[PDB]
Structure 1
Amino acid sequence: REKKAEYFAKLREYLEEYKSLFVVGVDNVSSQQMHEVRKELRGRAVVLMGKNTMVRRAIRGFLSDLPDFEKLLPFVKGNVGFVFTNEPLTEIKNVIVSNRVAAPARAGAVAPEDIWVRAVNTGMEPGKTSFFQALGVPTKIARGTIEIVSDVKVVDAGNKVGQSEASLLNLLNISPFTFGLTVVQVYDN
C-alpha cells in the first residue's frame, strides 16, 4: 500500500465527518457549466462517478464512509459518485453581484423560442459568412433600417447540431442555452 493511502487513508480519513449530499448526473449538458458552479469556491469539488472496487473495499472493510447512502441500495449499476462537498447555497444571490461577462455556452444548441434580435451597426467588414444556400436569411438594408423578406425556422428540440453555423451570427455576448435545472438530490443529514 503506497499510492492508495493518498486517496483513501488521506483525503477520506481526514474528512470523514461530512453529512452533505449533492447528487447530480451529467446526462447531456456542457460539462463546464455545472463544473465551474460546483467549483468557483475551487478546491472542494471533484466528480467521482466511480467504478467497481468494492470487492477490495469489503476485503479491507472498515470504512463507514457515508451511512446516509442507504436509499438507492439496489442500484449497483452505474452508481452515482462519492463526491465530498459542504458548500452553502445562499452565496450567489448576495456575495457575488454584477458578473455579466461570463462565457457563452457551446454556441449551436437549440433555443426555446423563435426570436430575431435587431442588429445595430458597428462599422466592420463582412467576414466568412458565404454559407447559406440551403435555407438562408432573406434581408434588405437601407441605412440601418433593415427589412426581412421571409422567415425561416431551422430545427426543434430533440436533434443534434450542425458543424459550421456558429461563426458570426450571435455577436451579442449571450449564452444561448444554459437556463436549466439538473440535479438528482440536494440534502443534508
Structure 2
Amino acid sequence: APWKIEEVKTLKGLIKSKPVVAIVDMMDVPAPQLQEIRDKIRDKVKLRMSRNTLIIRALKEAAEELNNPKLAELANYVERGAAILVTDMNPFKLYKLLEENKSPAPVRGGQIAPCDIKVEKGSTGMPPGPFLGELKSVGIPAAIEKGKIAIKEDKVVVKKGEVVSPKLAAVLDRLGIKPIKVGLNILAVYEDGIIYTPDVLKVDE
C-alpha cells in the first residue's frame, strides 16, 4: 500500500537525521497533557508515531543502510504502543527530561503499583451516604465526624508487588488522589555499539 511506503521512508529518514535514537511509549497518555509535553520538547527532539509493525522493520532496513548490527537489535524491544524519538541529546539528561515533566494521573484497575499507595485523611467534604460502605470493604477504618467521613489511619493500603482489585482502585478517583506519574516512558534506546534496558536510567544518582 502506497501510503505505507511513504511512511517508512519518512521514518528512516528521520532516524538517521540525529545521533540519538529513542523508542518511547506514549500509551495511556491523554491528548492535552501530550500536547503540553509536546511543545516543551519541540525544538530539542522530534517525534512521529506509526504502526509498530511499520516500525519493526523501519530502523532494521536502515540498520542495513548505515551498516550496524545491533541498532536493529533494539527492535527486539518493542511493546505496547510505540513511537520513535530523535535528538542530539544522549539518554541520561533526556530521561530526566521526560520523567520530570510528567503528570500525576489517577489509578485504574488490574494494575501493579509504581510506588507505594496512600490516602489524605479525615474530612473528604461532601454529603454522607453510601460512599462509606465500600471504604470499609477494603481494609479502611473510617468513621463519620462533622459533616462526613473521616479516615483516621496512617499505615499501608496496598503494598507494592501485589495488585489492586477491579476497584479497590478508586476511592481515590473519587477522593481525587492521582498518586502515579505518567507520561512518555522509555522502552529502550542507544546509539553507538552499546544498548541498554530502561532500568539503568532510574539509577546513576
SS in 2 for 1:141: strand
Tell me, yes or no, if structure 1 residue 184 matches structure 2 residue 188: yes
Q: Distance in 2 between the 1:10 and 1:147 partners?
A: 55
1:78-157 matches, within 5 Å, as: 78-80=76-78, 83-86=84-87, 104-107=105-108, 109-110=112-113, 112-113=115-116, 115-131=118-134, 135-143=138-146, 146=150, 148=152, 153-157=156-160
Find the counterpart in structure 2 of residue 20 from structure 1.
20
Between the two proteins, the alignment pairs up a number of residues equal to 170
Q: Distance in 2 between the 1:86 and 1:133 partners?
A: 50
Shift of residue 11, structure 1, vs aligned partner: 5.1
TM-score (norm 1): 0.52
Find the counterpart in structure 1 of residue 28 from structure 2.
32
TM-score (norm 2): 0.49
Q: State whether residues 129 and 168 of structure 1, in contact with CA within 8 Å, keep that contact through their aligned partners in structure 2.
A: no
Residue type of the alignment partner of 2:2: E
Provide the identity percentage: 15
SS in 2 for 1:21: strand
1:114–1:121 distance in 2 versus 1, CA, 3 Å:
closer
- Say which one has the larger Rg: 1
Q: State whether residues 121 and 151 of structure 2, in contact with CA within 8 Å, keep that contact through their aligned partners in structure 1.
A: no
Q: State whether residues 39 and 45 of structure 1, in contact with CA within 8 Å, keep that contact through their aligned partners in structure 2.
A: no
Higher helix share: 2
Shift of residue 162, structure 1, vs aligned partner: 0.9
Q: Distance in 1 between the 2:83 and 2:140 partners?
A: 49
Unaligned runs of 5+ in 1: none
Find the counterpart in structure 2 of residue 164 from structure 1.
167
Unaligned runs of 5+ in 2: 193-205
Shift of residue 137, structure 1, vs aligned partner: 2.4
Shift of residue 163, structure 1, vs aligned partner: 0.9
